[PDB]
Design a protein around this ligand. Structure first.
Ligand SMILES: CCCCCCCCCCCCCCCCCC(=O)OC[C@H](COP(=O)([O-])OCC(O)COP(=O)([O-])OC[C@@H](COC(=O)CCCCCCCCCCCCCCCCC)OC(=O)CCCCCCCCCCCCCCCCC)OC(=O)CCCCCCCCCCCCCCCCC
Ligand SMILES: CCCCCCCCCCCCCCCCCC(=O)OC[C@H](COP(=O)([O-])OCC[N+](C)(C)C)OC(=O)CCCCCCCCCCCCCCCCC
Ligand SMILES: CCCCCCCCCCCCCCCCCC(=O)OC[C@H](COP(=O)(O)OCCN)OC(=O)CCCCCCCCCCCCCCCCC
Ligand code: SF4
Ligand code: SF4
Ligand code: SF4
Lengths: 112, 76, 114, 94, 176, 154, 206
């Protein structure tokens, strides 16, 4: 057990494996309320499932951190919380729907 | 107090400069008759909130177009 | 002709915010004249407030009216909070500007401008 | 550099350092204020042949942006994840 | 690569704790600070005796402007207006006409020294070394107007400072 | 009569120029060269020019940097609170006449639109030595004053 | 070649792939995606997508753009929507930068991005001050750089360089006063553009 994450305000996590299993599982549940063909669901389930499989396949925290490449394991937990928060916001936003409106003809033309 | 409330309403209006006392009547319209502006009416109401010491919201204030209607509103 | 609104969805809604702003300005002038120790009368200050409102009386676009109210409230906040100094308040009155000529003959005598 | 030996000893002891080795005033160690003239080199485009500007024209090799999508499979990141920094071996801790 | 500025654990043995107690009660580190300022009291100060002594400058120094001549006395400036075009502050105003002998010369050459940012672009741009920033920096005035240089003032500066200006150009022109 | 008035003028002039306490308006980069004038190499204190004086104890205002429109009222207010005799030193192109920002919508084209200026120090920035030359020029201006001689002849 | 900036195809390919990735996930909002020849990725979006797109890029595990480097506007009068709003983001996780662009006119509010990045607070105030773009639901929208009571938005292309008013101290009223601007020397306009095309690669079709 490390004594500090080295980042001010980021407390050390006593049980990182259990915390990540809970978070990644929560994410796959929220993603189930998104349409099956939405790219956000397919892509997020893919990366979430890869991380969850890494967590189960590696009991040593320092070796798990190397596998995930997300910095400290406490950083990886925080990113999982961010993804879970994002997944819930996407359900209300529904960004997989068609483009709301095309721009005017020369909107993105440069130089004029 | 209906007389008491009404007498004060007229007292303020005469104090207001842009109204001729002789033209003034308890049934005159601020616009159609007295020939006042929208912002003139708003100033009058603000004087009403001062004499009677309570707040008159804009939704209600836009209906008070004659001295009599002010009496009716203050009754409540 | 279908646009995003700012605050008001029509002129009646916008005209309410104008009246609320006018009342706020009307009641603030007496404290402004005292706090800034201005030499103008309270009537002058209110006469100036009314003049500022009246030059915008011809607007019929609720979005434009909304921005005028938005800007008018910023100006009020600057005044009530004494972020403005005395110079900023008195800039509305153009005391050092001499009266420009308005009729054709006067403008003709002094220069070339229309 | 003009301090007496006693004063030199006194200020060295008070500061705890050998101040005379690293005086903050400059004496003769600074470069002369008159120097021999330079003879500066020339750049790589200073050639009499095989030097056409159209083969070394950086500005004209600029291109408009590549439009990858216009409103007219594995997940990816904008780049590989950053590598962990290594602790200094010169002096890991102050 | 990184290092920790402030990540150390105090030793909690009795000797170390008593060392920190002595520092707290006997103000040892504060006394150690008094030693530093005491040692500076007995150092020679860095002050120079201005205006009898001057800070060192180099030939590249950008000071007061001047208009230069050829050895014959003819003006170098031929009113090309490159200096006026490059001036980041628009501090230069030039007018020109054919001289009575047909030479291409200026009739106006003004530098607003209160617009000028003393950047040296004018003397880089000049193709004939006509306008230069000379070595003088001691030309403060009592009025704003005195800092609005016309051509007569700038030619007078060139005649006043040419001895030093030429020598400085001689020292640096091989870097240009 | 003449001799006493002249000698007394010399005395008060010498005291005032030998004890010039500046209020520095460090508006922008020119303020850095002012710090260098206080730094050991030039040591403005050795001339009797204390490093930083309070505005109500000040005899000279040094405007060291760009004066914006937003700042102009505050600068005038400080000048008016200064006790007399008071002098103003304008430092650098910005304060002298707007400088690089002369054509900006937000910049006063010279602090002499706001306060009377005694000395103009050119440069962008003037070197610390150039500013010191200017301060000494102000000292010489004070040495030329004849307040008591003019008072005697009223 | 000593004088030519080298290309970096690996970064160009990575950024292009991520640009398509973002466009696939938020088709509701993404209008255009492009990568420049010096490898900068730009996402052009409908203005309704400001909050969803910025939130996604901040929070998504394959983006993690946790830092808002800059937020600014550009005035282009020839466009119906003259103001281009530019967000420059930085991802420390993937050591990458992305640029998100949307548009608005003089009367259309843009949603404030303060909920996503607290850094946006003052940047949006600056945009309002300098360009007059109104941000909706800002905690405190007001001028930040200009003088109190200053009229107009100076960074608009049609606002004159020296402005409309200037200040001086007036002795009669004993205060600083504002008056119409008169310049002792008018700013001298220069016409510098060469009449010969410089860059064929950017020639516009006639
Ligand atoms: C305490 C005072 C002790 C008196 C003795 C001081 C002395 O002579 O030392 C100078 C002498 C030179 O100092 P340095 O920095 O090593 O050398 C620099 C140059 O070499 C300096 O030499 P230089 O090569 O640069 O030659 C230039 C200089 C050569 O320098 C000199 O001529 C020396 C002038 C010093 C004379 C001081 C007289 C002391 C009178 C005592 C009363 C004053 C105190 C009350 O010539 C001059 O410019 C002469 C100008 C005269 C200046 C005014 C001196 C008189 C002051 C008294 C006024 C009374 C009225 O120092 C020594 O020889 C070491 C012993 C001095 C005592 C040191 C004790 C330090 C205090 C202990 C720590 C406590 C801190 C709390
Ligand atoms: C109480 C009585 C105090 C008498 C103070 C006398 C000051 C002496 C003095 O003037 O210094 C010499 C000063 C020295 O002159 P200075 O001030 O010009 O200094 C020149 C030397 N540098 C360049 C280093 C500054 O003499 C004078 O300035 C002439 C004016 C005399 C002022 C006294 C009038 C009595
Ligand atoms: C056998 C029986 C014996 C019985 C008697 C035994 C008694 C003797 C043994 C005990 C020794 C007692 C020492 C008394 C000195 C006072 C000590 C003290 O108060 O220091 C503590 C004080 C605060 O310390 P701090 O680190 O900020 O935090 C501690 C609390 N949180 O820190 C400070 O006070 C710092 C002071 C700040 C001021 C700085 C400027 C002064 C520095 C120069 C001082 C020079 C010394 C003065 C000499 C005077 C000469 C006349
Ligand atoms: S030094 Fe720079 S700012 Fe001054 S006149 Fe020359 S080009 Fe213009
Ligand atoms: S000073 Fe030099 S650059 Fe300027 S107009 Fe004269 S010749 Fe041309
Ligand atoms: S004159 Fe030059 S150095 Fe001084 S404030 Fe202006 S730009 Fe900065």
């Amino acid at each position: 057990l490390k004594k500090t994450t080295g980042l001010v305000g980021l407390a050390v996590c006593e049980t990182p494996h259990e915390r990540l299993k809970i978070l990644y599982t929560k994410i796959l549940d929220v993603l189930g309320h998104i349409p099956k063909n939405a790219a956000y669901r397919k892509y997020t389930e893919q990366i979430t499932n890869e991380k969850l499989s890494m967590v189960k396949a590696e009991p040593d925290v320092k070796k798990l951190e190397e596998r995930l490449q997300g910095g400290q394991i406490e950083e990886v937990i925080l990113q999982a919380e961010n993804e879970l928060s994002l997944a819930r916001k996407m359900i209300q936003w529904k960004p997989w729907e068609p483009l709301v409106e095309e721009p005017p003809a020369s909107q993105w033309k440069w130089p004029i | 107090t209906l007389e008491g409330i009404k007498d004060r309403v007229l007292y303020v209006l005469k104090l207001y400069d842009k109204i001729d006392p002789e033209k003034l009547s308890v049934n005159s319209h601020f616009m159609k008759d007295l020939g006042l502006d929208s912002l003139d009416q708003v100033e009058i109401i603000m004087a009403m909130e001062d004499e009677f010491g309570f707040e008159i919201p804009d939704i209600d204030a836009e209906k008070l177009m004659c001295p009599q209607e002010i009496v009716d509103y203050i009754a409540d | 002709t279908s646009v995003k609104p700012i605050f008001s969805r029509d002129m009646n809604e916008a005209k309410r915010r104008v009246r609320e702003l006018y009342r706020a300005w009307y009641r603030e002038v007496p404290n402004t004249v005292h706090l800034f120790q201005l030499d103008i009368s309270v009537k002058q200050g209110r006469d100036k407030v009314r003049e500022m409102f009246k030059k915008n009386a011809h607007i019929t676009d609720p979005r434009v009216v909304d921005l005028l109210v938005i800007k008018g409230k910023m100006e009020l906040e600057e005044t009530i909070k004494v972020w403005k100094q005395r110079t900023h308040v008195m800039r509305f009155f153009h005391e050092t500007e001499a009266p420009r000529p308005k009729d054709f003959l006067s403008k003709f005598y002094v220069g070339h401008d229309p | 550099a003009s301090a007496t030996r006693f004063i030199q000893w006194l200020r060295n002891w008070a500061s705890g350092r050998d101040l005379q080795a690293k005086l903050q005033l400059r004496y003769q160690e600074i470069s002369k204020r008159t120097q021999p003239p330079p003879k500066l080199p020339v750049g790589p485009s200073h050639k009499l042949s095989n030097n056409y500007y159209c083969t070394r024209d950086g500005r004209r090799e600029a291109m408009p942006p590549s439009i990858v999508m216009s409103s007219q499979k594995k997940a990816v990141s904008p780049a590989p994840p950053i590598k962990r920094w290594e602790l200094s071996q010169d002096e890991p801790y102050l | 690569t990184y290092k920790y500025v402030n990540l150390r654990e105090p030793s909690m043995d009795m000797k170390s704790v008593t060392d920190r107690a002595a520092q707290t009660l006997l103000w040892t580190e504060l006394i150690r600070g008094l030693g530093m300022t005491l040692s500076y009291l007995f150092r020679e100060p860095a002050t120079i005796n201005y205006p009898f002594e001057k800070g060192p400058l180099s030939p590249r120094f950008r000071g007061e402007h001047a208009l230069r001549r050829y050895p014959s006395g003819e003006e170098r400036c031929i009113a090309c207006k490159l200096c006026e075009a490059v001036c980041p502050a628009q501090a230069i105003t030039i007018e020109a006409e054919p001289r009575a002998d047909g030479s291409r010369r200026t009739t106006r050459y003004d530098i607003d020294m209160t617009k000028c940012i003393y950047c040296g672009f004018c003397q880089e741009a000049c193709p004939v070394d006509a306008i230069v920033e000379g070595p003088n920096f001691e030309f403060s005035t009592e009025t704003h107007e005195e800092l609005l240089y016309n051509k007569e003032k700038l030619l007078n500066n060139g005649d006043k400072w040419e001895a030093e200006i030429a020598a400085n150009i001689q020292a640096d022109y091989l870097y240009r | 009569g003449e001799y006493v008035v002249a000698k007394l003028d010399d005395l008060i002039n010498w005291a005032r120029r030998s004890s010039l306490w500046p209020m520095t308006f460090g508006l922008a980069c020119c303020a850095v060269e002012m710090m260098h004038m206080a730094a050991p190499r030039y040591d403005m204190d050795r001339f009797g020019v204390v490093f930083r004086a309070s505005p109500r104890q000040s005899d000279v205002m040094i405007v060291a940097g760009t004066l914006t429109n937003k700042m102009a009222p505050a600068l005038r207010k400080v000048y008016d609170q200064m006790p007399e005799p008071r002098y103003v030193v304008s430092m650098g192109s910005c304060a002298n006449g707007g400088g690089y920002y002369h054509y900006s919508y937000s910049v006063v084209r010279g602090c002499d639109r706001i306060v009377p200026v005694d000395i103009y120090v050119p440069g962008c920035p003037p070197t610390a030595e150039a500013l010191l030359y200017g301060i000494l020029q102000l000292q010489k201006k004070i040495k030329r004053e004849k307040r008591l001689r003019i008072w005697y002849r009223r | 070649r000593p004088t030519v900036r080298p290309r970096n195809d690996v970064a160009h390919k990575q950024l292009s792939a991520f640009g398509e990735y973002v466009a696939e996930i938020l088709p509701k909002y993404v209008q255009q995606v492009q990568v420049s020849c010096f490898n900068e990725l730009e996402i052009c979006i409908h203005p309704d997508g400001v909050i969803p797109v910025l939130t996604f890029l901040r929070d998504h595990s394959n983006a993690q753009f946790k830092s808002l480097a800059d937020l600014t506007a550009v005035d282009i009068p020839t466009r119906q929507n003259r103001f281009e709003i530019v967000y420059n983001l930085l991802s420390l996780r993937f050591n990458s930068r992305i640029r998100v662009k949307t548009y608005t006119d003089e009367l259309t509010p843009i949603e404030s991005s303060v909920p996503v990045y607290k850094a946006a607070n003052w940047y949006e105030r600056e945009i309002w001050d300098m360009f007059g773009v109104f941000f909706a639901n800002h905690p405190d929208l007001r001028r930040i750089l200009t003088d109190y009571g200053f009229e107009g938005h100076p960074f608009r292309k049609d606002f004159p360089l020296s402005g409309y008013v200037e200040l001086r101290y007036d002795d009669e009223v004993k205060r600083v006063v504002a008056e119409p601007v008169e310049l002792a020397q008018e700013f001298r306009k220069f016409d510098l553009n060469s009449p010969w095309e410089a860059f064929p690669a950017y020639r516009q079709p006639p």
